[PDB]
Amino acid sequence: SEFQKVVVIDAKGHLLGRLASVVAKQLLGGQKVVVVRCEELNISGHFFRNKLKYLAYLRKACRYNPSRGAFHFRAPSRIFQKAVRGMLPHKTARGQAALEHLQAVEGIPPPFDKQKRVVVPAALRVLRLKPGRKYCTVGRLSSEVGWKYNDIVAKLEERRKVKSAAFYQAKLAKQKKIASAKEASPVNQKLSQFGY
């Protein structure tokens, strides 16, 4: 709980509204936020109801120049951005600057796949939803509302998980070597009465 320049949030298993509210409060506090893996955000309510909610959202359009009408964004990252910006005073310079401090992406791009990704417990579905309750996935609602990049993200995420697993195995082996040398070192038992 210390002020970092950039917080990378792995949005897997989170709730859209709860994560948006927490992020919107951090941006007004003046913190750069990168919400990666937005195709895994969870929304309460069963999938058919959520798709009806979204398909009702498409209905809002101008009767003159739908080019000026409401802009319906189908990407899961843009869905999260719409949720976040609705919780911000974006009509003012403060809120407009706050939006510039948020980077919502699909998947985990290489500039952010090699950085620690914290999670928000106040938005996690496992901790915040009663078991036995129906929910949906934004990355699934997006595919059946118009989003057309689901397959590429899934493929590029399988590659990323494979590479990350290889990296962790190498780091775990090095950590095992360091861990083995730990008790071999003597001061770790000689004067460890301080609790370390």
Next chain:
Amino acid sequence: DIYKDETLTIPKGVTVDIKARNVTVTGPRGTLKQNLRHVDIEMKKQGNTIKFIVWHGSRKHNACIRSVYSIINNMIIGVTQGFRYKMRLVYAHFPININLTENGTVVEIRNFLGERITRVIKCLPGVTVSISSAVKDEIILEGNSLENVSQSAANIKQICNVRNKDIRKFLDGIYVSERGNIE
């Protein structure tokens, strides 16, 4: 109620591994895998018995215990004795032509009420279709998954359906005649 329980005793069916609601039951006839992630219940296995346990579950969630009990029992019955569905081809004037390809996994049907069309189905996994010579125009679907065999049966019956004709007189179609096990 605090503790609602169901108990299942396993026959000579070898393995009933239940890792993470993904049951993989291996028996003499074959191996069936099926997922239970849709429900949240305890599966406590001891000896030759499995206990499906729900703590503090509501009646809606308690409706799923016996359902899980039944599907696991049906899976065990499939890996031990299997399932066999027997249909009789019913035709009044036009004989119905049946073809079996890729060892019974696709059925092509012709001449149903004088059709020039070819109605093709692909059977669900674990199902094989054969024609029995004991009785004429007899179709048999044999397999291990009751759901797959019976859903294959429903697909045959619904695709061979009479349209815009008076069903009180036009009796042509394919119907399920007997349901049972291989042994």
Next chain:
Amino acid sequence: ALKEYQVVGRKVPTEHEPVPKLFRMRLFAPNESVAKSRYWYFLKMINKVKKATGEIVAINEISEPKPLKAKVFGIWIRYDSRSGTHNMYKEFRDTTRVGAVEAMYADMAARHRARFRSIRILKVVEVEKKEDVRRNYVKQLLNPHLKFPLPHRRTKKVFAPHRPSTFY
């Protein structure tokens, strides 16, 4: 919170009634003032004794004799509903009569939208006999081999670095 009180009272003695009878009621109220008013309206509706010509002679808070023993309390109450009349009898397992009454008030406000003034308590009695218990959930608690995992585990320090355990 609530405290159980005993209120003993009588009308002011006169020539007609030199020795008025003494009326004692066991009732629950947050404080003595509410208890006295709670008693006075009860006395009005049961025995038609006016508040003006009466007086509260004794007020005594009562503490639970054995607050460290789990008990089962059956509560006979009367409800004012749309029809203005209903009778209910509930059972609560708790170590204190006050807590049982508090649980009853919370449950009734949760279920039948009942308020403190709408609920009047007839009798709160202890049921020591297991057979005399009527409620199945109370009997479930009274079974000897009761066991169950923790329900509703539910678990500033925002931005946790690791995923929650929410298990053992």
Next chain:
Amino acid sequence: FKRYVEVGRVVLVTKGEYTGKLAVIVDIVDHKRALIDSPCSEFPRQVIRYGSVVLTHIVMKLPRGARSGIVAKKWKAQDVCNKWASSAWAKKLEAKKVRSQLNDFDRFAVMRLKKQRREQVNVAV
């Protein structure tokens, strides 16, 4: 690793003025509250809800509704104290407590000591 709410399960209080203390469940009052005791004198008999405590893995034989006197008697007989400490979980908790009790001079002691721990970083080639 189940941690069923039994009669006689020892538990670790995590919320309230008795945070960090060790108790044992004597009776299960209801779905959401229970009665606990402990041989330690500073912790009195009381009824506590399950949201203010985490169950441990140690189960000790204990008749239902027992008084604090024999609860201490059975606790000492089966040696529950220092059986909880034998678990690495208690070692981590007490290590955190000692680290919290630590001070600036002794923090500088830890400074030097862990520097001497990183002294070696010796790995066989």
Next chain:
Amino acid sequence: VSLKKKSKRRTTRLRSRIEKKAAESKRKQK
């Protein structure tokens, strides 16, 4: 999204008219 055909929010004349005519209903039943 509202996900409704009729708005759940009410106009000020409409909300005021309820207390106008709900009271008259009690007057009539009296």
Next chain:
Amino acid sequence: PKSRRSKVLTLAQTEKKGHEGKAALFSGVQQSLDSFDYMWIFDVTNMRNTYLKRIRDDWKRIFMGKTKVMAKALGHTPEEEHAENVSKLTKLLHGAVGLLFTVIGYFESFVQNDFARAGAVAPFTHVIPAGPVYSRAGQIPLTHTLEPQVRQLGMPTVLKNGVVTLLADFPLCTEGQQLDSRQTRLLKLFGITAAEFKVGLLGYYSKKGASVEFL
């Protein structure tokens, strides 16, 4: 308002007595115990009501009520039991057994044949010829007008040209095999008299002898 199974009702107007019927049966059991003689132990079997009426005809009464209801009314303990040494007789008293007043030779010898029931074993391996159905399995010198039986059979038969025809022969019964409900129902339409009513005369609760043997 609640997901509960519906309880349909009809206009039979034939409600039973229940507890009153049980009390009447107990009173009748006491009267039968107080009756004169012949101390029978036989109430019913797999035989039909016509067979029971025929057996009751050779008597001047077979009646037991609910089984073990008369035994409960009599009482396992000899003090409650009206007869003597009834402690061992109550244990043997199970199933359909009851008293009568009119015998031994007729019960031992006269066993009229009757249609078989499920659970038993067929006396032979009954088979049914293919093609048109035979009412008496070839013993009729057999109308095929059982058109509704084609729909109500479930056997491998097709109603062709207004006549129920079986595509292939189906063995209805097999020797040494337990009789199932489907086999019993199919054999009901035919002449399967695989039954033999019997009686039990192990002992007699005589007024003077009071020797209820277990032979």
Next chain:
RNA sequence: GUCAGCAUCAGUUUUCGGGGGCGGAAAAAGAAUAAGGGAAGGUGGCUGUUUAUAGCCCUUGUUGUAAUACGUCCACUGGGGACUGAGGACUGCGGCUUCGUGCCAAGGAUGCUGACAUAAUGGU
């Protein structure tokens, strides 16, 4: 002249901590220890029973005049923070002091120190 820091005060105020009484069923509990009673969600023993190779509940005695808990009070006390410094010789009401041009937290802030002056404050 400008801006600061600290100390001792006065007015207002917020937030922690300790000590001590006094009340209730002179808390109720509880512990320890003597009687009797009852049993279980029945332990050892042998589904059924009555502390045995676990114990529980009820009443009484005792340790006792126990503590705790709450309420309440102290003209008992220890800290932390913030806003304000109006008035302008002397009286007055008071406490120490032996009276004392005596001193004092007693009819409204003084004391010490630092930095800057081409900077800082304040105005536009």
Next chain:
RNA sequence: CUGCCGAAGGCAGAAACUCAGAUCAGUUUUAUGUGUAAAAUGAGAGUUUCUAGUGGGCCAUUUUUGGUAAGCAGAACUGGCGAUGCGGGAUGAACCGAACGUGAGGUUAAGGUGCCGGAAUGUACGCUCAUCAGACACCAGAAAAGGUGUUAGUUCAUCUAGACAGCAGGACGGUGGCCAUGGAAGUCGGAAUCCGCUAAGGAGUGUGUAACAACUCACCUGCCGAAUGAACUAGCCCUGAAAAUGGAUGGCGCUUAAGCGUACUACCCAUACCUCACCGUCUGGGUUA
């Protein structure tokens, strides 16, 4: 330009003088029946005289009669508005607080504490899943009610003499009772609807048959071992119709709530309350050094 006083649906003020009073009160007691008379509390009370402005209306309140599908109309009192800014109810002539000099600090009211938004993604117990949920606000128009949605209750039922259900079986014989008919055997159709047996087989609950026959229940026996059923009430939930461009619990959103109900703390701030400084008006004391 500033200050002070300040209405009206006979008033407010000015001047002239009474009594340091029992002299008055949008008040409450006591006594007699809203009237009158003679203790509480508050206030200094007053009389004649003249002279500006106004004499309207909207909203709600409680007392009645005439009323009707349905609202509605006419009275009396009461206040608010009008001359009134401020906090809250997303915003507002009539809703909840609060009556306003310039400032500093503290504390609140009403309403609130997921984000927009200052304040607990607090604690505790329950209810609810809605393929057009709820935040609504006597839920009053539709409103009378429907639902195999859920949770609680109230009143009657059987139940280790074996409960409900489930499978096995019996479910009969006079009799195809009598008129009725091509053909009707319990079941096209006209009154019942009796009897031998029981533990029970209804002149028969439905299907079906030209007629039959066959199956089923409603009625009993075998196995099986514990609770089960019926009628009502309460809360939430669905439904109880509504159209015409995009669409609104204020928005985003929220489902162990950020919805509904209660309980307990903590917290947020109005021009309101408290302490202080200052400005002005009024009132009172003193002032020939």
Next chain:
RNA sequence: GCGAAACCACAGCCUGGGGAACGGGCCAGGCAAAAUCAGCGGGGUGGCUUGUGGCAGCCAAGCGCGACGUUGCUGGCUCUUCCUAUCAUACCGAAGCAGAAUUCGGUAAGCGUUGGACCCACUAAUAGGGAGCUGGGUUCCUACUGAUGAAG
């Protein structure tokens, strides 16, 4: 090259609300990027309501009423878009539906719903409604559409 005038509080996007008058200013949202050109003229009062009539009697779940029942009697010519309460087309269920043709009902507004003097033809059908013009009858700016256009 010459060169006006009317008009002018200030201006200029829409949706829902702002008790009304909803407006452009206020509330909550969609949105929002200089400078311009040529066109065309748009912009200067119940949460009502719907499909089932009036009088009398008999019940009677229940609280003198009493529900359903039950019985008694006499304006037209062209135009953008939206709603479904669907005439046709698509797919379904029921019916003496043998076939053909057809009736009713469900999802369904994607796409059509004409030509002539209620009449007579065509058509698969000629379904119902919401938000520039003429006849007989009384004695600037903004929008829309195209066209350029400085700029990281």
Next chain:
RNA sequence: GUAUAAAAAUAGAGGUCUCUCCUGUAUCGUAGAAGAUGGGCGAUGGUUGAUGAAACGGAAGUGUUUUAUUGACUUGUCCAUGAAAUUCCAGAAUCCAUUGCAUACGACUUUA
């Protein structure tokens, strides 16, 4: 201190039949006149800078490893010097020209 990269479930995960989680209050790092000048003792390590070469990383590759050569500093431990009156916080394109696949004028499509 601009320090920390598996994945997945939560009615289960991972490690060697056994063990661990039950939150980062963790781990890495952390002295020095803002990091000075020397002396030893102990280890071949750490910080690594500079270059020089290998491999890897394409989702926005914002970088990763591997080294090599060296120049450094090497708190690993133990000693000696100086700090202060900072004496109480602060090469292209376009115009002119041309074209007619275009065109009110711009623009466009060609030539030049």
